[PDB]
Amino acid sequence: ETLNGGITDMLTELANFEKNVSQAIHKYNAYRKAASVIAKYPHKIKSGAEAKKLPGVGTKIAEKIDEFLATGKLRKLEKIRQDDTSSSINFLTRVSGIGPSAARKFVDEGIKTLEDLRKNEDKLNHHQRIGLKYFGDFEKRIPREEMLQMQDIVLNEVKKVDSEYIATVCGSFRRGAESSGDMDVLLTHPSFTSESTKQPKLLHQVVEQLQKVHFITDTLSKGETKFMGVCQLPSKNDEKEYPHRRIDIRLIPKDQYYCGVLYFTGSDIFNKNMRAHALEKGFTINEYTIRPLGVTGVAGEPLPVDSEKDIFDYIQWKYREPKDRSE
Template structure:
């Protein structure tokens, strides 16, 4: 079972790789989201560091790298491995659940359920394919493709093709390629891999949209499927699917502190009883930032 790569290749790729692996373990197996966020934040900060890290002490000077993570960095730099990861990889439960969550559409809870039913590998999943939902079936079918990373230059060509197709079908359509591509990373993750498949579906999808209510003027592309989003929800969707997940979590937390609830569909004010009110008008991503009094951050500044 191969491990996931960090968001992009860096001078400290070995360190970011093991931090991402630990993060996935904490999220998928232990369901410890706070630890997941801590490892992800440390990996993101280290990925941006312009020099090769030589010690845990050096890493600890970076915001988001605490004493325990610094100790792990020292261990990795001195031995080339991490005892905790060796133990995790040798544990059948941990390794199987982590692997299953790499299939698009299978989250930690579903992965554990499948494991308890004796499902551990892709071959096992294929035997119960009839039990998978449509999203999971797509994830299984295109597993190898979704695992690959795409150079940014290739993504730019795909983006041009898709937006050209949109323009030819109807000048009112707008589209945004999100995820790590929009955040400016050099290597794009599986969340954008769908674009290679999308061209075959475009004519069908967009011609079908012509028969849908004019509320659905915008088409939003999401992992392994297309998604039709009403135009009044478009920018909340763009914000959410651009990520990163940690940035989204922090922004949603701030929104709550300011008296709003924010998700991929809408931003709503919270009433005195804590119940959300009517969705607020959103004509751009910046509108969302303004509502919660947060300084606007360009997509390239959201890779936390």
């Protein structure tokens, strides 16, 4: 956690690199398992050899470890860090819609910069066009203060269309958090569950609503159960207009809301731990349900959940407020 930080740190850097710039899923995979193990390791790594004794620890990495242990740097690391081409990939990739593949292709064509990016909007698909377009806005955190105003709004339409609609804004926001990156709204409805062969219109009505009033300005992706978009609070009585905010809303089979909702709420560690627990308590948890465990090794049979509670209850725990879902 700190005794092995640098090593892991350089390691991740290393890894991350093969992955994006190069197409070395392998090496890239190498660096990570190794990064994973040395991380665990209970002691100050003193040399390659020592490290080497490890699992996933080859001679390639031992080597890197020593040079880094000796000199507070790495050549390959310095070289990469410098590398323009490589610097460029790492950067374009910020655009919502640009991933490694496309980042490399763009470079190869010569789009290393944002401007380049612009001159060549034609070379860009709608997801990316918008990624570029709200680039600033997208990089910016979400003041809870605004979170609250947004939420206030969705809740209002959700209900205005059909009153049956259930919506929860999950995420860190839900976990109390001061700021957030984007708003995640978990949607569900009674007339929609496990079986009852969809009802696409269900998603589609609200989207149409939200856009109806100008809360949604753009569509990133919108399908029968997950709409990816762009929202924005009404820029008031002028002088201060609002930043453009990422927003995702999902339709949920009513029969598996709370497990889903439980989950998206996290935190990433609270989950695991929660999950780790259900297991002892003879269970299984995952993104949609919770099934009693059978001693044959495995077992099925999705228990019925009416709220975040049932789920606790089942695994027989203390209901923990979203606020303290930290770990």
